[PDB]
Coordinates of all heavy atoms in Angstrom, one line a residue:
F1 N 0.9 -1.2 0.0 CA 0.0 0.0 0.0 C 0.9 1.2 0.0 O 0.6 2.2 -0.8 CB -0.9 0.0 1.2 CG -1.8 1.2 1.3 CD1 -2.8 1.4 0.5 CD2 -1.6 2.1 2.3 CE1 -3.6 2.5 0.6 CE2 -2.3 3.2 2.4 CZ -3.4 3.4 1.6
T2 N 1.9 1.2 0.8 CA 2.8 2.4 0.9 C 3.5 2.7 -0.5 O 3.6 3.8 -0.9 CB 3.8 2.2 1.9 OG1 3.1 2.1 3.2 CG2 4.7 3.4 2.1
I3 N 3.9 1.5 -1.2 CA 4.5 1.7 -2.5 C 3.6 2.4 -3.5 O 4.0 3.2 -4.2 CB 5.0 0.4 -3.0 CG1 6.2 -0.1 -2.2 CG2 5.4 0.4 -4.4 CD1 6.5 -1.6 -2.3
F4 N 2.4 1.9 -3.4 CA 1.3 2.5 -4.2 C 1.0 3.9 -3.7 O 0.7 4.9 -4.6 CB 0.0 1.7 -4.3 CG -1.1 2.3 -4.7 CD1 -1.3 2.5 -6.0 CD2 -2.1 2.7 -3.9 CE1 -2.5 3.1 -6.6 CE2 -3.3 3.3 -4.3 CZ -3.4 3.5 -5.7
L5 N 1.1 4.2 -2.5 CA 0.6 5.5 -1.9 C 1.5 6.6 -2.4 O 1.1 7.7 -2.7 CB 0.6 5.4 -0.4 CG -0.2 6.5 0.3 CD1 -1.7 6.5 0.0 CD2 0.2 6.6 1.8
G6 N 2.8 6.4 -2.3 CA 3.8 7.4 -2.6 C 3.5 8.2 -3.9 O 3.2 9.4 -3.8
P7 N 3.5 7.5 -5.1 CA 3.3 8.2 -6.3 C 2.0 8.9 -6.3 O 1.8 10.0 -6.9 CB 3.4 7.1 -7.3 CG 4.4 6.2 -6.8 CD 4.1 6.2 -5.3
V8 N 0.9 8.4 -5.7 CA -0.4 9.0 -5.7 C -0.4 10.2 -4.8 O -1.1 11.2 -5.2 CB -1.4 8.0 -5.2 CG1 -2.8 8.6 -5.1 CG2 -1.5 6.7 -6.1
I9 N 0.4 10.3 -3.8 CA 0.6 11.6 -3.1 C 1.4 12.6 -3.9 O 1.0 13.8 -3.9 CB 1.3 11.2 -1.7 CG1 0.4 10.5 -0.8 CG2 1.5 12.6 -1.0 CD1 1.1 9.8 0.3
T10 N 2.4 12.2 -4.5 CA 3.2 13.1 -5.4 C 2.4 13.6 -6.5 O 2.5 14.7 -7.0 CB 4.5 12.4 -5.8 OG1 5.2 11.9 -4.8 CG2 5.3 13.4 -6.6
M11 N 1.5 12.7 -7.1 CA 0.8 13.1 -8.2 C -0.5 14.0 -8.0 O -0.8 14.8 -8.7 CB 0.3 11.8 -9.0 CG 1.4 11.3 -10.0 SD 0.7 9.9 -11.0 CE 0.5 8.7 -9.8
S12 N -1.1 13.8 -6.8 CA -2.3 14.6 -6.4 C -2.0 15.8 -5.7 O -2.9 16.5 -5.3 CB -3.2 13.7 -5.6 OG -3.4 12.4 -6.3
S13 N -0.7 16.1 -5.3 CA -0.4 17.2 -4.4 C -0.2 18.5 -5.1 O 0.6 18.6 -6.1 CB 0.8 16.8 -3.6 OG 0.5 15.7 -2.8
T14 N -0.8 19.5 -4.5 CA -0.4 20.9 -5.0 C 0.9 21.5 -4.3 O 1.8 22.1 -5.0 CB -1.5 21.9 -4.6 OG1 -2.7 21.2 -5.1 CG2 -1.3 23.2 -5.4
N15 N 1.1 21.1 -3.1 CA 2.2 21.7 -2.3 C 3.5 20.8 -2.7 O 3.4 19.7 -2.9 CB 1.9 21.6 -0.8 CG 3.1 22.0 0.0 OD1 4.2 21.7 -0.2 ND2 2.8 22.9 1.0
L16 N 4.6 21.5 -2.6 CA 5.9 20.8 -3.0 C 6.4 19.9 -1.9 O 6.9 18.8 -2.2 CB 7.0 21.8 -3.3 CG 7.1 22.3 -4.7 CD1 7.9 23.5 -4.9 CD2 7.6 21.1 -5.6
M17 N 6.1 20.2 -0.7 CA 6.6 19.4 0.4 C 5.8 18.1 0.5 O 6.3 17.1 0.9 CB 6.4 20.2 1.8 CG 7.6 21.0 2.1 SD 9.0 20.2 2.3 CE 8.6 18.9 3.5
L18 N 4.5 18.1 0.1 CA 3.7 16.9 0.0 C 4.2 16.0 -1.2 O 4.1 14.8 -1.2 CB 2.3 17.1 -0.1 CG 1.6 17.6 1.2 CD1 1.8 16.5 2.2 CD2 2.1 18.9 1.7
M19 N 4.6 16.7 -2.3 CA 5.2 16.0 -3.4 C 6.6 15.3 -2.9 O 6.8 14.1 -3.3 CB 5.6 17.0 -4.6 CG 4.4 17.5 -5.2 SD 4.8 18.5 -6.6 CE 3.6 19.8 -6.5
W20 N 7.4 16.0 -2.1 CA 8.5 15.4 -1.5 C 8.2 14.3 -0.7 O 8.9 13.3 -0.7 CB 9.4 16.5 -0.8 CG 10.7 16.0 -0.3 CD1 11.8 15.7 -0.9 CD2 10.8 15.6 1.1 NE1 12.7 15.2 -0.1 CE2 12.2 15.2 1.2 CE3 10.1 15.6 2.3 CZ2 12.8 14.8 2.4 CZ3 10.7 15.2 3.5 CH2 12.0 14.8 3.5
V21 N 7.1 14.4 0.1 CA 6.7 13.3 1.1 C 6.4 12.0 0.3 O 6.8 10.9 0.7 CB 5.5 13.8 1.9 CG1 4.8 12.6 2.5 CG2 6.0 14.7 3.0
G22 N 5.7 12.1 -0.8 CA 5.5 11.0 -1.7 C 6.7 10.4 -2.2 O 6.8 9.2 -2.3
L23 N 7.7 11.1 -2.5 CA 9.0 10.6 -3.0 C 9.7 9.8 -1.8 O 10.4 8.9 -2.1 CB 10.0 11.7 -3.5 CG 9.4 12.5 -4.6 CD1 10.5 13.4 -5.0 CD2 9.0 11.7 -5.7
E24 N 9.4 10.2 -0.6 CA 10.1 9.5 0.6 C 9.3 8.2 0.8 O 9.9 7.2 1.2 CB 9.9 10.3 1.8 CG 10.5 11.7 1.6 CD 12.0 11.5 1.3 OE1 12.6 10.6 1.7 OE2 12.5 12.4 0.5
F25 N 8.0 8.2 0.6 CA 7.2 6.9 0.9 C 7.7 5.9 -0.1 O 7.9 4.7 0.3 CB 5.8 7.1 0.7 CG 5.0 7.7 1.8 CD1 4.1 8.7 1.7 CD2 5.3 7.3 3.1 CE1 3.4 9.1 2.7 CE2 4.7 7.9 4.2 CZ 3.7 8.8 4.1
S26 N 7.9 6.3 -1.4 CA 8.4 5.3 -2.4 C 9.7 4.7 -2.1 O 10.1 3.6 -2.1 CB 8.4 5.9 -3.8 OG 7.2 6.5 -4.0
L27 N 10.6 5.7 -1.6 CA 12.0 5.3 -1.3 C 12.1 4.3 -0.1 O 12.8 3.3 -0.1 CB 12.9 6.5 -1.0 CG 14.2 6.3 -0.2 CD1 15.1 5.3 -0.9 CD2 14.8 7.6 0.0
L28 N 11.2 4.6 0.9 CA 11.4 3.8 2.2 C 10.7 2.5 1.9 O 11.2 1.4 2.4 CB 10.6 4.6 3.3 CG 11.3 5.9 3.7 CD1 10.4 6.6 4.7 CD2 12.7 5.8 4.1
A29 N 9.5 2.4 1.3 CA 8.7 1.2 1.2 C 9.4 0.2 0.2 O 9.1 -1.1 0.4 CB 7.4 1.4 1.0
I30 N 10.0 0.7 -0.8 CA 10.6 -0.3 -1.8 C 11.8 -1.0 -1.1 O 12.1 -2.1 -1.5 CB 11.1 0.5 -3.1 CG1 11.2 -0.5 -4.1 CG2 12.3 1.2 -2.8 CD1 11.7 0.1 -5.6
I31 N 12.5 -0.4 -0.2 CA 13.7 -1.0 0.3 C 13.5 -2.5 0.9 O 14.3 -3.3 0.5 CB 14.3 -0.1 1.4 CG1 14.8 1.3 0.8 CG2 15.5 -0.7 2.2 CD1 16.1 1.2 0.1
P32 N 12.5 -2.7 1.8 CA 12.3 -4.0 2.1 C 12.0 -4.9 1.0 O 12.4 -6.1 1.0 CB 11.1 -3.9 3.2 CG 10.5 -2.6 2.9 CD 11.6 -1.7 2.5
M33 N 11.3 -4.5 0.0 CA 11.0 -5.4 -1.1 C 12.2 -5.8 -1.8 O 12.4 -6.9 -2.2 CB 10.0 -4.7 -2.1 CG 8.6 -4.3 -1.6 SD 7.6 -5.8 -1.6 CE 7.8 -6.4 0.1
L34 N 13.1 -4.8 -2.1 CA 14.4 -5.1 -2.8 C 15.3 -6.1 -2.1 O 15.8 -7.0 -2.7 CB 15.3 -3.8 -3.0 CG 14.4 -2.7 -3.8 CD1 15.3 -1.4 -3.7 CD2 14.1 -3.0 -5.1
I35 N 15.3 -6.1 -0.8 CA 16.2 -6.8 0.0 C 15.7 -8.0 0.6 O 16.2 -8.6 1.6 CB 16.9 -5.9 1.0 CG1 18.3 -6.4 1.4 CG2 16.1 -5.9 2.3 CD1 19.1 -5.6 2.5
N36 N 14.5 -8.4 0.1 CA 13.7 -9.5 0.7 C 14.5 -10.8 0.8 O 14.5 -11.5 1.8 CB 12.5 -9.7 0.0 CG 11.5 -10.6 0.8 OD1 11.4 -10.6 2.0 ND2 10.8 -11.5 0.1
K37 N 15.2 -11.2 -0.3 CA 15.9 -12.5 -0.4 C 17.1 -12.5 0.6 O 17.6 -13.5 0.9 CB 16.4 -12.7 -1.8 CG 15.3 -12.8 -2.8 CD 14.1 -13.7 -2.6 CE 14.5 -15.1 -2.9 NZ 14.7 -15.4 -4.3
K38 N 17.6 -11.3 1.0 CA 18.7 -11.2 2.0 C 19.9 -12.1 1.7 O 20.0 -13.2 2.2 CB 18.1 -11.5 3.4 CG 17.0 -10.6 3.8 CD 17.1 -10.1 5.1 CE 16.0 -9.1 5.4 NZ 14.7 -9.7 5.2
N39 N 20.7 -11.6 0.7 CA 22.0 -12.3 0.4 C 22.9 -11.1 0.1 O 22.6 -10.0 0.1 CB 21.8 -13.2 -0.8 CG 21.1 -12.6 -2.0 OD1 21.5 -11.5 -2.4 ND2 20.1 -13.3 -2.6
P40 N 24.2 -11.5 -0.1 CA 25.2 -10.4 -0.2 C 24.8 -9.4 -1.4 O 25.3 -8.3 -1.3 CB 26.5 -11.1 -0.5 CG 26.3 -12.4 0.1 CD 24.9 -12.8 -0.1
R41 N 24.2 -9.9 -2.4 CA 24.0 -9.0 -3.6 C 22.7 -8.1 -3.4 O 22.8 -6.9 -3.8 CB 23.8 -9.8 -4.8 CG 25.2 -10.2 -5.5 CD 25.2 -11.4 -6.4 NE 26.3 -11.5 -7.2 CZ 26.5 -10.9 -8.3 NH1 25.5 -10.2 -8.9 NH2 27.7 -11.0 -8.8
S42 N 21.6 -8.6 -2.9 CA 20.5 -7.7 -2.7 C 20.8 -6.7 -1.6 O 20.0 -5.6 -1.6 CB 19.2 -8.5 -2.4 OG 19.4 -9.1 -1.1
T43 N 21.5 -7.0 -0.6 CA 21.9 -6.0 0.4 C 22.7 -4.9 -0.1 O 22.5 -3.7 0.2 CB 22.6 -6.7 1.6 OG1 21.7 -7.7 2.1 CG2 23.0 -5.7 2.6
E44 N 23.7 -5.2 -1.0 CA 24.5 -4.2 -1.7 C 23.5 -3.4 -2.6 O 23.6 -2.2 -2.6 CB 25.6 -4.7 -2.5 CG 26.2 -3.8 -3.5 CD 27.3 -4.4 -4.2 OE1 27.8 -5.5 -3.7 OE2 27.7 -3.9 -5.3

């Protein structure tokens, strides 16, 4: 939900700080997805 939420906040926002907030949601929530397999390569 957070991965989906980020871009929708950036896309629907008039204020720039809320656009930045959406960029943060995407950055934070993708990280656990990327590193799920937990091995030396996905951690890097």
Side-chain angles (χ1 to χ4, degrees):
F1 178 73
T2 300
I3 288 159
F4 165 75
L5 192 74
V8 178
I9 295 168
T10 308
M11 275 187 290
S12 308
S13 294
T14 312
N15 180 313
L16 271 166
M17 276 299 312
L18 286 302
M19 293 181 216
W20 181 77
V21 160
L23 303 184
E24 304 305 324
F25 278 143
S26 308
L27 160 60
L28 300 176
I30 197 177
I31 294 279
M33 297 280 94
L34 303 173
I35 207 176
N36 191 38
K37 307 301 287 287
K38 302 224 174 57
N39 52 50
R41 272 159 169 271
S42 72
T43 297
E44 165 177 344

